């Protein structure tokens, strides 16, 4: 890999510079280099890997949605034929996004998840595995679509089972996992009532545990709870 000659600490330092410079493709390549050194990631390093790839795939998903919408409009009645270009360019962006999700999944499989024994790391990586299968499912339309949805599902469900055994209901990783999985149920699995149940239950269980928190932990947990409530408002 092109980062093989760079020190682990210098890749971490440059990922944090690239974040300040709003250059997450660079940030994700430094963090990929850091994971490929083979050592476990600390909590802060785990956050840099997830912010980098989320911003890379977020730009791809936004572009794919604009191109899909133009392509679907082109495919209505009374719409003028414009040739293969919208389809081709949608496919080029899709293939690129698939390749970034495959890269993240490959890092988790080789071998971040197998080496993660603490609940905070293992839940974090399994949430990421669910998230990146979810972005694959967002563009899937072929014979493996069911299987991609099930792989997301499986990963999120293993993360939920560990989170509920090992973490308090206000833990921000547990809350962001529940937020994410609820959106998987609503948008991917066509299960809006499972989505709304999971967001309500997660919000109420976290509310009841706020009293145990410091001011700073309270602010971290309530920020995520407000996202659950905003989705519930958008779904009910």
């Amino acid at each position: 890999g092109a980062m093989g000659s760079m020190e682990r600490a210098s890749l971490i330092q440059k990922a944090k510079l690239a974040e300040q410079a709003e250059r997450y493709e660079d940030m994700a390549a430094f963090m990929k280099g850091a994971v490929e050194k083979g050592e476990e990631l600390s909590c802060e390093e785990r956050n840099l890997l997830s912010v980098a790839y989320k911003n890379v795939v977020g730009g791809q998903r936004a572009a794919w949605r604009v191109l899909s919408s133009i392509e679907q409009k082109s495919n209505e009645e009374g719409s003028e034929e414009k040739g293969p270009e919208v389809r081709e360019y949608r496919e080029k962006v899709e293939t690129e996004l698939q390749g970034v999700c495959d890269t993240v999944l490959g890092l988790l499989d080789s071998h971040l998840i197998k080496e993660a024994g603490d609940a905070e790391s293992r839940v974090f990586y399994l949430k990421m595995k669910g998230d990146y299968y979810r972005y694959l499912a967002e563009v899937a339309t072929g014979d493996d679509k069911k299987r991609i949805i099930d792989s997301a599902r499986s990963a999120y469900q293993e993360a939920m089972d560990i989170s509920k055994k090992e973490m308090p209901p206000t833990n921000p990783i547990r809350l962001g996992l529940a937020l994410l999985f609820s959106v998987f149920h609503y948008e991917i699995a066509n299960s809006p009532e499972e989505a709304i149940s999971l967001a309500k239950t997660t919000f109420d269980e976290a509310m009841a545990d706020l009293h145990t928190l410091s001011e700073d932990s309270y602010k971290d947990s309530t920020l995520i709870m407000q996202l659950l409530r905003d989705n519930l408002t958008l779904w009910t």
């Binding site: 956050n47 997830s50 912010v51 989320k54 977020g58 998230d131 962001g176 937020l179 994410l180 959106v183 609503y186 948008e187 995520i224 996202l227 905003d230 989705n231 958008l234 779904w235």
Partner: peptide, 6 residues
């Protein structure tokens, strides 16, 4: 729908 991280 909101998901994290941003």
């Amino acid at each position: 729908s909101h998901t994290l991280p941003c």
